[PDB]
Design an enzyme around this catalytic site. Structure first.
Site, PDB file in Angstrom:
ATOM      1  N   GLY B  28       1.442   5.325  -6.209  1.00 35.66           N
ATOM      2  CA  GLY B  28       0.174   6.053  -6.011  1.00 35.66           C
ATOM      3  C   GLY B  28      -0.530   5.585  -4.735  1.00 35.66           C
ATOM      4  N   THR B  43      -0.374  -0.312   1.975  1.00 37.20           N
ATOM      5  CA  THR B  43       0.782  -0.662   1.181  1.00 37.20           C
ATOM      6  C   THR B  43       0.627  -2.086   0.645  1.00 37.20           C
ATOM      7  OG1 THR B  43       3.105  -0.657   1.005  1.00 37.20           O
ATOM      8  CG2 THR B  43       2.240  -1.806   2.927  1.00 37.20           C
ATOM      9  N   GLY B  44       1.375  -2.487  -0.374  1.00 34.82           N
ATOM     10  CA  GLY B  44       1.278  -3.857  -0.864  1.00 34.82           C
ATOM     11  C   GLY B  44       0.098  -4.106  -1.796  1.00 34.82           C
ATOM     12  N   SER B  71       0.049   2.951   3.436  1.00 30.54           N
ATOM     13  CA  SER B  71       0.973   3.234   2.362  1.00 30.54           C
ATOM     14  C   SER B  71       2.350   3.546   2.902  1.00 30.54           C
ATOM     15  CB  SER B  71       0.472   4.493   1.619  1.00 30.54           C
ATOM     16  OG  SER B  71       1.539   5.086   0.915  1.00 30.54           O
ATOM     17  N   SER B  72       3.411   3.200   2.172  1.00 28.32           N
ATOM     18  CA  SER B  72       4.752   3.519   2.658  1.00 28.32           C
ATOM     19  C   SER B  72       4.967   5.019   2.633  1.00 28.32           C
ATOM     20  CB  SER B  72       5.812   2.812   1.804  1.00 28.32           C
ATOM     21  OG  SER B  72       5.568   3.148   0.429  1.00 28.32           O
ATOM     22  N   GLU B  73       4.152   5.792   1.911  1.00 28.05           N
ATOM     23  CA  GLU B  73       4.295   7.236   1.829  1.00 28.05           C
ATOM     24  C   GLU B  73       3.319   8.037   2.664  1.00 28.05           C
ATOM     25  OE1 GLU B  73       6.140   8.217  -2.029  1.00 28.05           O
ATOM     26  OE2 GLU B  73       4.721   6.798  -2.923  1.00 28.05           O
ATOM     27  N   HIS B  92      -1.573  11.273  -4.645  1.00 31.65           N
ATOM     28  CA  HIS B  92      -0.151  11.245  -5.012  1.00 31.65           C
ATOM     29  C   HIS B  92       0.050  10.197  -6.081  1.00 31.65           C
ATOM     30  CE1 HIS B  92       4.184  10.965  -4.766  1.00 31.65           C
ATOM     31  NE2 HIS B  92       4.103   9.695  -4.420  1.00 31.65           N
ATOM     32  N   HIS B  94       2.993   8.924  -9.485  1.00 35.37           N
ATOM     33  CA  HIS B  94       4.240   9.061 -10.200  1.00 35.37           C
ATOM     34  C   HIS B  94       3.896   9.253 -11.691  1.00 35.37           C
ATOM     35  CE1 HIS B  94       6.416   6.425  -6.861  1.00 35.37           C
ATOM     36  NE2 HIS B  94       5.838   7.486  -6.330  1.00 35.37           N
ATOM     37  N   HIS B 155      10.749  12.048  -8.454  1.00 33.23           N
ATOM     38  CA  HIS B 155       9.734  11.204  -7.780  1.00 33.23           C
ATOM     39  C   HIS B 155       8.336  11.272  -8.360  1.00 33.23           C
ATOM     40  CE1 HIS B 155       8.365   9.958  -3.498  1.00 33.23           C
ATOM     41  NE2 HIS B 155       7.407   9.662  -4.375  1.00 33.23           N
TER      42      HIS B 155
END
Ligand code: ZN
Ligand code: ZN
Ligand code: ZN
Ligand code: ZN
Lengths: 208, 208, 208, 208
Positions: B28, B43-44, B71-73, B92, B94, B155
Site C-alpha cells: 500500500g 518505501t521502507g 514507494s517502490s510502486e 493502491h 493489496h 497483485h
C-alpha cells in the site's frame, strides 16, 4: 540490547499478533536469539498477564531457567536457530488460514508476487509430527533450509527473520497469502500461478 | 493547500486504510497531485512510524527529492495522473478480496448497483507485469481510461478520485464488491448480473 | 421525545452499525417515525461528520425541510411506515452477507431458530428495481406485509421495529443468518432447515 | 468467592465474548456454579447495560430469585452442572462457525491437534430440540458425558470448564476448529484427519 528490552518486544509481539488476528487464544509463542540460546514466552500464562520477568531463558544445551516453564513448543524454536544462522527471531502461531492450508497438506504456490518475501516460489508445508517432539523439530529444520516461513501440517505456521518486527510482518504476509489461496481454491483448482522466471525477476528486484 | 497539510492527509489515509482492513502490513502506497508532480509515501518506513517529513515529492520528470526513497510502486501513480487529468488522489493496496479476484484474472461484473461508482458496468482487471516497471504502468493507464478503479492481475487494486477521501471511499467500495463476487461465485458460476440498460439508468441517476 | 434526542439516536445508530461491520462506507440510512412523517439521515454527509442538525424532517406528503437533502433512499423508508403501522424505526444497509444472498435472489429459509425474530419461517427477498423509485417502494411494502425484515435483490437489507435499538438488533441478526446460509450453501445445497411446525412452536415461545 | 465477584466475572465474560466475535447481539448466556445452584445472566437486558445486581440466582430446585428473569436457556446450564460434577462454569453462544457446523448436523472430527482440549477426538453435535425444553436438556447432558464442549444442531455451542476463563478459552478454541473445518470442507470432503492413536498421544501429552 539488555534482556528486559528484548523481553518487552517479545511481549509486544504477542500483543500485536493477537491484535492482527493471527493469534487466537493461548496458542502462539515467540522467541529471540540471545547469548548462547534464546528468550521465549512461558507456557501457561495468558498473553495479557505476561510481564518481562515471565520470559524464560533457555541456553544452548536446552536447560531452562529455574522456576520458569518455557513454551511447550520451545524445541522447534531452537531447531530454527541452529538451522538458520541468520535468524534472530521466531514467531509461531496457529493462524486460521495458514492452518487450514496445512490441514490440506499443501504448499502455498506462487499465486501472488509477495510469495518471494519468504525466499522463493513457495511456502512449504512440513509433515505432521507430535508437538514438542524431536521428530517435529527435524521436519521444521529441513523446511527452513531455503525458506524463512513454513506451514506445519495439521498445526500452524513458523516464520523467522532478522528481528521481531520483520518476523511478525512475514507471519502476517503468509496469513494473507494463505487466505488468498483458500478463497481462490474454493472457486478454481488449480489456482493460476506466476511462472518461476517471473518469481526470479521479483526476487532480484526485492534484493535491489 | 500547503505541503504539510497534504502530507498529513496522506498519512491519515494510510491509517484509515489499515483500520478499514484494506491494508495488510507494509503493502500500500498513497499519493496526491501536487505542483508539477506528486507527493507519495516513502518505501521502507512502516505506516505507523510515518511523519509529515517522510513524504516524498517526485516532480513531473520523475526526479525525487534528495535523501528520500519514494514507494517502490511510484511509476503507476504517475501513469494514473497523466492518463486521468481529473484524478487528484491515488490509492493502491493489496486488499484480500480484490487481489483474490485479480488472481482469477476476472473483471468484477455488475452484481450490485454500486459498480457504477467506478464509472461503468465493471471493475476491470489489467494484465500482470512486474511491479515498478514501465510495462505495468502502460496497462494501468489503459485500464483507467474509462474507469476510476482497476484490479491488477496477481497483485491488487488502484483507485483514483478528486481527493483522498473519495479515493479511499471508492477503494473500500471495490473491496466490498470483490467480496460480494467471491462469496457468490463459490455458490454459483456465473453470478447473476444487472443488465447494461439498468446500469445506464443508475449512472444517470448518480449524475443527478 | 424531543427532536434532538431522536436525532442523537439516529446518529448513534449509524455509528453502532458501522462498528458492528454492517455498514461499509457511505451506504446505509436510518430513520424514525416522528409527527406526521419522519426524521432521516441526509444524503452526502459521511456518518462521522454527522451532527444533530444534519437530520432531515420529511413530512407525510413527502416534503423535506428547507436546505437539507434527505437520503437518496428516503421513499422506501416512507413506504415501510405506511405499510407497517407498528414500525417506529427503519434501518437500511448494504451489509455484505445479506447483499450476497440478495444477489442470488433467494430467501433465507429456516436454517436456525432465530429466523422467527423477523416474524415467520423466512427472510424474503424483494425483486430488483432502481434505488429511489416508486417501483422499489411497492416491492418493499409488499415484502414487509408479514415480515419485519427483507432483502432487496442486488442491493441490501431493510429492517423495521418498534425502536432503533431493536431495529439495529434485528438487522444484525439477519446478517448472521445470511452468513450462516452462505457458509453452509457452499458446502451443501440445499441447506437443511427446520420444519414449519418447529418454527410455529418457536414463534409461540417467542411471544411468551 | 463472594456473590458480587462472581457476578463481575460473568459480566466480564459476556463482554470478552462479544469482543472476541463469538457473541453476536443478545444471544449468549453465561453461568457459574454457586452454593446449591448457579448464578446466570438475565433474559432481556443487553450485555452492555448489565450490572452485578442483574445476575440471577437459581437454586438446585430450579427456583429463581424474586423479581429477576433468568436467561430463557437456563435449563441446559443446570443440566450441564448435574451431568458434569467437575464443571464450575458454562458458556453458551451462537458463534457463527460453530452454528454453521451445527446446521450441517456434523461433529467436528480431528482436523487439528487442539481438538483434544474438549477431551477426545471430536466435538459432537447434539440433536435439535426446542430451546428451553427438557428434551434439549437431556441431549446436552448426554453429549457432555465425555466431552467439555458440544454443538447443538441448528443452534450453537455449549462449553464447560473449571472456571470462566477456561470456559471462554475453550469456547473460542472450538469456534477456531469450526472455522477450520468449514473452510477446508468447501475445498475437499472429507477433510483429512489425524488418527485415533495420534490423538491419544496428544491427550497424554496434554495431561503432562
Ligand atoms: Zn503450535
Ligand atoms: Zn502493489
Ligand atoms: Zn441502499
Ligand atoms: Zn441458544
Amino acid at each position: 540490547m539488555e534482556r528486559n528490552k528484548l523481553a518487552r518486544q517479545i511481549i509486544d509481539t504477542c500483543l500485536e499478533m493477537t491484535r492482527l488476528g493471527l493469534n487466537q487464544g493461548t496458542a502462539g509463542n515467540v522467541s529471540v536469539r540471545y547469548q548462547d540460546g534464546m528468550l521465549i514466552t512461558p507456557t501457561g500464562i495468558p498473553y495479557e498477564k505476561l510481564t518481562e520477568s515471565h520470559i524464560v531463558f533457555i541456553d544452548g544445551n536446552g536447560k531452562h531457567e529455574e522456576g520458569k516453564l518455557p513454551s511447550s513448543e520451545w524445541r522447534f524454536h531452537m531447531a530454527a536457530y541452529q538451522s538458520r544462522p541468520d535468524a534472530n527471531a521466531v514467531v509461531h502461531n496457529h493462524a486460521v488460514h495458514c492452518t487450514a492450508v496445512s490441514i490440506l497438506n499443501r504448499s502455498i504456490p506462487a499465486i501472488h508476487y509477495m510469495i518471494a518475501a519468504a525466499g522463493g516460489n513457495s511456502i512449504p508445508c512440513a509433515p505432521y509430527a507430535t508437538f514438542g517432539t524431536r521428530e517435529l523439530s527435524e521436519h521444521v529444520a529441513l523446511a527452513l533450509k531455503n525458506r524463512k516461513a513454513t506451514l506445519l501440517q495439521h498445526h500452524g505456521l513458523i516464520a523467522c527473520e532478522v528481528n521481531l518486527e520483520k518476523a511478525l510482518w512475514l507471519a502476517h504476509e503468509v496469513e494473507v497469502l494463505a487466505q488468498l489461496y483458500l478463497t481462490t481454491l474454493a472457486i478454481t483448482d488449480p489456482v493460476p500461478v506466476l511462472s518461476d522466471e517471473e518469481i526470479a525477476v521479483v526476487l532480484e528486484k526485492f534484493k535491489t
